[PDB]
Design a protein around this ligand. Structure first.
Ligand SMILES: Nc1ncnc2c1ncn2[C@H]1C[C@H](O)[C@@H](COP(=O)(O)O)O1
Ligand SMILES: Nc1ncnc2c1ncn2[C@H]1C[C@H](O)[C@@H](COP(=O)(O)O)O1
Ligand SMILES: [Cl-]
Ligand code: NA
Lengths: 520, 61, 61
């Protein structure tokens, strides 16, 4: 038969294939969908009143719908695969994908007298649809939990969909928009029924898997001397102290002086903090210290900020308070976890072209030099883009994000997601799922009221995401061995990126993308 | 709003530095990290930031 | 009631690779056939949890 209950409505594909440039990832996981909001759209707001501050106010709605998110690299990549990709390519980018939902099973749970039994409702349905026109608030790219699990074996719960609208305090404005998912043409399923579609990534720039092997400043030959001169002295050396103009040709020895065609990238000052406890000043400056941007009278934290080097050499302990991504160690607590639990990423690789996060961009003269007045200079903590700058985008990690929807705005600049990734105008459409409400027996005499009693049930099934990535091979003529991600030989009680003695896959550290080195 | 671009119900898989010093009397430096949630919306990381600005003097009707 | 074949270890070399317990030594023996019952989750909690489901319906095939 075509579609029956005693028939697999799809298969399990979890494979990675490398041919030439194209690497194909395929993942399958087993999901479970709870009933959300008792089949109800609820208005949710957080007020100014009460303990909560004004910066955490919001207005929105929580829907009875769940959504499928695969926006995390680890979903499509095995740790071993991530290794192959990082260690041999100068870049890569998504090309197309394929989604599938199958072997859907709906169960109805009954409880009597502390006795609980779960069996099948076959006639029951499950609704699915894609926001192919992008008419629904984009949830994804907010780094929200609920993406497919990293380990294929694990079975996961489907995230609940909800959105935010313009708000003043705990109130909404005239502008704020209320969306109803049901007002969307969605496809329905019964077990033996399957859903699926395909999408093709708009053209996007290859991510850089290469870390520079020349600093922006050191772009010139040591042996030669520039044909240009610079002002070397305003005053005669020694006792005389009489103003004079002396000019010198910037040479190899005087490298700093010599003129350059390109200058470092932009910077927003980030407060510095040291892993060692003692060094830090004894105040709770987590918030007061941190850089932030104020929008509509509300100050939001600048996380994770513009792309900047985490630390200057040998300052490894240092990190921006808010200027890097942080990943919890497995089993880590959501609130107030200790330092040991967290994995603080490090973006030092990009130090060569990008400004250090914790230091000034540089200095600019504050006044005209005078016969009486002395020259002055001021520091640059906040530096915007100017002609001649070059820079590197923030890195993605095996457990990082992949893409993000570029806001539909009149304009924007270098729209590469600040958390790292590919910026798409038309990203993979949001996939929405929901269990169709099955009413409990209605009262015998007609009632104008809307039914408030339903059979309790949840659904389960497999999901498949297959993505085709385009690689960009290395062309380096570097004579010496390059740096590469490896797993240390030395013995240990547990294996890296494996299950422990209890059956708990764990990702020991974040894994960057740039190991291979390319010239500037 | 640009800031409110994320789902209320869910919590980010990323942590932020929530405290530099222990709460209460002790006042000894420590590093505490929390996952930005729905309640703590301001803290959570974002992919896009507001546009440029040149300060304009304010005046009241 | 003995054994039938055995997979010759993928090694640089070997000598008279006939299984020592008796049988036929194959480089590519009959492939291992793997089976498993697909996990069927017990009803999930109503409010989303980042945790991986630990409750399943008990079943065999
Ligand atoms: N990841 C990503 N997504 C979307 N747009 C991006 C991305 N990275 C850079 N850009 C911007 C930068 C330029 O404005 C344009 C490509 O020009 P070019 O001269 O090639 O830099 O796209
Ligand atoms: N059972 C079995 N499996 C695999 N290889 C085997 C077996 N018995 C012998 N051999 C080896 C012995 C020789 O190296 C080769 C056949 O050569 P010949 O000159 O025919 O002995 O195969
Ligand atoms: Cl975690
Ligand atoms: Na709710």
């Amino acid at each position: 038969g075509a579609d029956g209950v005693g028939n697999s409505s799809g298969n399990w594909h979890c494979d990675s294939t490398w041919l030439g440039d194209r690497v194909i990832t395929t993942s399958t996981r087993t999901w479970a969908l709870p009933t959300y909001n008792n089949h109800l759209y609820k208005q949710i707001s957080n007020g100014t009143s009460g303990g909560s501050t004004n910066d955490n106010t919001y207005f929105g709605y929580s829907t009875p719908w769940g959504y499928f998110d695969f926006n995390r690299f680890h979903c499509h990549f095995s740790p071993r695969d991530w290794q192959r990709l990082i260690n041999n390519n100068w870049g890569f980018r998504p090309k197309r994908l394929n989604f599938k939902l199958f072997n859907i099973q709906v169960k109805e749970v009954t409880t009597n007298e502390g006795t609980k039994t779960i069996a099948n409702n076959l006639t029951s349905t499950v609704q699915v649809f894609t926001d192919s026109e992008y008419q629904l608030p984009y949830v994804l790219g907010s780094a929200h939990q609920g993406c497919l699990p990293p380990f294929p074996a694990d079975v996961f719960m489907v995230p609940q969909y909800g959105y935010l609208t313009l708000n003043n305090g705990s109130q909404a404005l005239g502008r704020s928009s209320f969306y109803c998912l049901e007002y969307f043409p969605s496809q329905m399923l019964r077990t033996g029924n399957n859903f699926q579609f395909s999408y093709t990534f708009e053209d996007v720039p290859f991510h850089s898997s290469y870390a520079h092997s020349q600093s922006l400043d050191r772009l010139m030959n040591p042996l030669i001397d520039q044909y240009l001169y610079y002002l070397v002295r305003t005053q005669t050396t020694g006792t005389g102290g009489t103003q004079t103009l002396a000019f010198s040709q910037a040479g190899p020895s005087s490298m700093a002086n010599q003129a350059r065609n390109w200058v470092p990238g932009p910077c927003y000052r980030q407060q510095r903090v040291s892993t060692t406890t003692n060094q830090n000043n004894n105040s709770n400056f987590a918030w007061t210290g941190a850089a932030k941007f104020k929008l509509n009278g509300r100050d939001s934290l600048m996380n994770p900020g513009v792309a900047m080097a985490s630390h200057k050499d040998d300052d490894d302990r240092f990190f921006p308070s808010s200027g890097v991504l942080i990943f919890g160690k497995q089993g880590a607590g959501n609130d107030g976890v200790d330092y040991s639990q967290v994995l603080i990423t490090d973006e030092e690789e990009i130090k060569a072209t990008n400004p250090v996060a914790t230091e000034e961009y540089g200095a600019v003269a504050i006044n005209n030099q005078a016969a009486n007045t002395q020259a002055q200079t001021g520091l640059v903590h906040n530096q915007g883009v100017i002609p001649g700058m070059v820079w590197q985008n923030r890195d993605v990690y095996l457990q990082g994000p992949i893409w993000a929807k570029i806001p539909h705005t009149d304009g924007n600049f270098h729209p590469s997601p600040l958390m790292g990734g590919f910026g798409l105008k038309h990203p993979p459409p949001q996939i929405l799922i929901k269990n169709t409400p099955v009413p409990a027996d209605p009262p015998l005499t007609f009632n104008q009221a809307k039914l408030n009693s339903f059979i309790t049930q949840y659904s389960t099934g497999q999901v498949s995401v297959e993505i085709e990535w385009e690689l960009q091979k290395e062309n380096s003529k570097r004579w010496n061995p390059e740096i590469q991600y490896t797993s240390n030989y030395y013995k240990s009680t547990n294996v890296d990126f494996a299950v422990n003695t209890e059956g708990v896959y764990s990702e020991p550290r974040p894994i960057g993308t740039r190991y291979l080195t390319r010239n500037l």
